[PDB]
Structure formats: C-alpha cells, structure tokens
Design a binder for these strands. Structure first.
Lengths: 140, 59, 159
RNA sequence: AGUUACCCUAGGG
RNA sequence: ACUGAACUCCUCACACCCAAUUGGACCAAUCUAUCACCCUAUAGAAGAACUAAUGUUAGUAUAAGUAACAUGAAAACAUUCU
RNA sequence: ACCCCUAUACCUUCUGAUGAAUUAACUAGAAAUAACUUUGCAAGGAGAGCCAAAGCUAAGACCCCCGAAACCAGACGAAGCCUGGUGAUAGCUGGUUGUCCAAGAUAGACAACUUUAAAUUUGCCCACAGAACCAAAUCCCCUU
C-alpha cells in the first residue's frame, strides 16, 4: 500500500464532536452519527426563519393580551398607531407592555382616540375640520 | 416596582382565580374565554413554556 | 489485558496533619479469568454494592449461584489484606464501595463457533460503616422543589 | 428449420 | 382591517441552493528534492481521501443468558438395590 | 434534561420497491494523434529517421471496480470434477472515496441541448407591406 490515510481519527472526530449529546448509538458510531448530524445541521440552518416567525407570533400574542387588557383589539392598536405616525415595531410594543405598562396604556388611549376620530370622520362626510390626532406631519 | 426580586417574580407569575357564570350563555363562548385564561393568553408575560395559566371557575 | 485495579493498591498518600479528618482505608481487589459470564456475575456484584462485609458474606454464603462462592472468596481475601497489609484494625469496619464484573479473554471453540466465557470480578472496600441509604423523598421535598421551579421562571424572550 | 415437463445463465413483470 | 414567504424594503455582508459534464482555484495524508526543526515551506511524484457495492477480513453486539444439552438410588462410596 | 413549536431516515431505481447490526482495515479512471496553455528556437525546428506555405521541439492535461451459462486442451475419479486458456465473453444490475467558485435539463432521424477557448457582427422582441386556387394563428419583418 504505497500511501494510506493516517489522519482518519480526526475526520471521524470532526463528525462525532457534534453528536455527543444525542441518544443511543448516534453519539458514538460514525455511520449513524453522520446521518443524524447532517439532519441536525439542516435543521439548525432552517430554524432561523422559524425563529423570526415565532418571535413575531409571540410579540403579537403579547400585544393582543395587553391591548385586550384595555379593551382594545390588536388590529385597532396597530393600525391606529400607524395612523398617528408612531413607528413602533411589534417587538418594542411587547417590551413596553411587559415593562412600561403606563406607556402602554397611553399608547392604547392614543390608538383609541385616533380610532374614534376616524369613526367621526367617516360618519359626518363632507368638509369638517380634521381630528386633532388625525393630522399628519408632512416631510420633504 | 421597587419590590424585591423574589416578590416581584411571585407577583408577576401568580395565578388569578376567575369566575364565569354560565346561565343562558352559549357553551362555546364560555369555552373561548376559559381556554384563553386557562392557557394564560390574556397575560402580556405569556410564553408557552412559562406555565402561566389561570384558574377558571364556571358556575 | 489491562491490570490497573492491582496498581490501585500501591498509591501512597502523604502523611496527614493532626487537624484533618482521618482518611478511611481504601482496598482494591479482583479476581481474573473466572469461568463465568459477566452477565450472570453482574447480579451477584450488584447485590452487595453497599453492604457491610459481614452482610455481604452472609448473603453470598446462601446464594445458590456459582459466582457466589467465588465472590465470597474474593471478599475474604480482601478482608484479610485489609486487616494485615492496609492497616485496618477492625475486620467488621469495611463495606463494599465498588463491586463490578467485566469480561475476560473468552475462548472460541468449534462445534459452529461457541464462546467459552470468562470474567473478572472487581471489588473495592472502604473502612467504616456502610453509608445509610438515601431516604425516599417526602412530600415536603417534592413541594419545595416545585415551588423553586415556579420561582426560577423568567419572562422569556423579552428585555 | 422445429423443439426442450432436462433446459441453463443475466435481468424484467 | 388585520394575519401571512427564502418576494420586496431595511442594518451589514455579498463569489456562497441545480444532475451529469466541463473550466478555474485550493487542498488532507504519504514519498522525494531543497528548506524547516513541537510538525513546516516551495516544488516533483503517487497503490493519493469512502455513511452504502445481498464486497473481503478481523473485533464485538442483537436475537439471548433464549433454543438446546446432561447424572438410576442409598450408603461404609466397600457394597447393595431398582 | 423532558414538557412547547418545527421537523414523511438515507441510498438506488423509477416521470416523481433495493440495500445496510456495528466498529477497524482494505476497496474502484489506466491512452498525449490533433487541438489548447506555457517555454525554447524560428523559414526553420528536432541530439539521423520526422515535420514545415509559422512552423517545429518539450512539458502539462482524456479514457474504473465486482458479478454467467458456455466452448477448448490436458489430467483425476466413477457425464462429473480439477487445472489451464481466463482478468473468457454477452447482457443486466450495483458500487465508484476532499472542498470551493463559474457555466450548466426535453426536438428528432447522427442530430438537439450543454462546456471551454477564440474570431467577428448583429441576435432576440418586431409595423406597413407581403404568402392559393380548390378559427386560433404562423412565416417575413424596419422601428423600439
């Protein structure tokens, strides 16, 4: 055999160091470990999308809870805060719900007032002065 | 605020006993509220692994 | 063939200070190449795993299994070397800290290959009364653990 | 050119 | 109205989701030339890299301590009995 | 740690059943004609022979593994069996071992598509006009 692989403990080790926390023979036997480690790596790569999606779902759940604490609904809160030029994202709104609940109540009241303004604007169609919180700051 | 760590934690994650009268009420509408509060989906602290459900008593 | 268990009796600890607890004696013994399966001798080894030497000897003298006599012989030898070689003043003041069985160099025979099974019995004795068994956890321990679990939870995935 | 219930081998349904 | 993608924007990074095939650049280990001198460099070479071939050999598992196997009786182990 | 959410083992073959207990070792691409690239020298190159209307000389870089029945020759036993021809041959499976970047899949009766490199100039999309007597559209096609 003119030349044969001397450095083969280390390739096996490269795969096996990622399988030490498995169950059964996957943590020891290279042939089974490789399959499971490949699958684990594909899962880890694909879980970044799911991480982001699930974070937004959690934020939306927590904001829904928080706004129902004040009688609002999540659509009302989000939409009517957007209409007040308040570009707060879902993440920050959920931290405000948990940690700064007076600021959240103020934001909920701001959303409610904008929503009532919208209802008044749509009810009395015509030329009537705009709602105070309906006014938009223009940029140029 | 200005609580100690242990009481703050205890206050945040304590479970509240809710009462719901079911007289003349549709069972599904009762069930919606009961399921929401039993899971703890009414709390901004909600996480699926936090074990933050509440007690619901339906009479 | 590895023979570490024999070497484990040649460790010389440094002499102690007067203000230091007395280091209990530690004795290691084994028998090699016993015509018995390690699987069968595992039961006899497990039976005596925290017993005093006297209790273990009593239990083994009344077991019908073949490995009982062999383990009894190993234990008696260990008790002798403990009192004589390892400065254990009382024969009674020993307990089986370790008692395992490993596989030996098994032979292969032609019938149709069949295995003539051998095994090793390993024991470690420690000077002193056997440690008391762990009491079964009460309802108070359970409740305390549950309350701690409840107290250790955090607001997940936020500031 | 027929034939093999003596058929044989690699495959396929 | 809201929810909803790897689409689009956003902060940064951008050569980094196609079979065979082809082209380019690296490259583990080995041997040689010259270096190097706790394990390397530039080159030349080659029996040069394996999660699979009802592959070959060796070790050890599973089935499994499973299937199965064996010694007529008492006794002084002389003997006698069935 | 588990509990929650997400997640139809892999390989091969189909347009999208096969094999594998596990570990260790072993185990599978061999041809420089032309062309291309890089040098040398140059109407000559080459250490005879060979080539030459820029050629010639040199180098580099392309062509796997396992798996019949048979037939023949000579023995050995009572057609069989063995050795040799023999790595026989033909079919049909199966297997063919590091990484990165670039390009890279559907007509058919050798062709089509595909890769690399090179030379040059239009390519695709298309408007009027234009294509037969006995519906969709298509061909052609300047602009853009």
């Amino acid at each position: 055999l003119r030349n044969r692989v001397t450095d083969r403990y280390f390739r096996i080790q490269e795969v096996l160091k990622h399988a030490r926390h498995f169950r059964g023979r996957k943590n020891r036997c290279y042939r089974l470990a490789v399959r499971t480690v490949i699958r684990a790596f594909v899962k880890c790569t694909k879980a970044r999308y799911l991480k982001k999606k699930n974070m937004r779902t959690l934020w939306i759940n927590r904001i829904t809870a928080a706004s129902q604490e004040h009688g609002l609904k999540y659509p009302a809160l989000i939409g009517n805060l957007v209409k007040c030029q308040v570009e707060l994202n879902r993440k920050v709104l959920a931290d405000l719900a948990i940690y700064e609940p007076k600021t959240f109540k103020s934001l909920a009241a701001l959303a409610s007032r904008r929503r009532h303004e919208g209802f008044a604007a749509a009810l009395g169609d015509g030329k009537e002065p705009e709602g105070i919180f309906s006014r938009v700051v223009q940029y140029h | 605020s200005s609580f100690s760590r242990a009481p703050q934690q205890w206050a945040t994650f304590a479970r509240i006993w809710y009462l719901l009268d079911g007289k003349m009420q549709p069972p599904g509408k009762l069930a919606a509220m009961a399921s929401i509060r039993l899971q703890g989906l009414h709390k901004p602290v909600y996480h699926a692994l936090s074990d933050c459900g509440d007690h619901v008593v339906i009479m | 063939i590895s023979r570490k268990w024999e070497k484990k009796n040649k460790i010389v600890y440094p002499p102690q200070l007067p203000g230091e607890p007395r280091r209990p004696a530690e004795i290691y013994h084994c028998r090699r190449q016993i015509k018995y399966s390690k699987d069968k001798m595992w039961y006899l080894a497990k039976l005596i795993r925290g017993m005093s030497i006297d209790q273990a000897l009593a239990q083994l003298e009344f077991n019908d299994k073949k490995g009982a006599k062999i383990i009894k012989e190993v234990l008696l030898e260990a008790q002798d070397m403990a009192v004589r070689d390892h400065n254990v003043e009382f024969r009674s003041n020993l307990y089986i800290a370790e008692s395992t069985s490993g596989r030996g160099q098994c032979l292969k025979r032609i019938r149709g290959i069949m295995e003539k099974v051998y095994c090793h019995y390993f024991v470690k004795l420690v000077e002193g009364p056997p440690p008391p068994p762990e009491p079964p956890k009460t309802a108070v321990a359970h409740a305390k653990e549950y309350i701690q679990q409840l107290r250790s939870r955090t607001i997940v995935h936020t500031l």
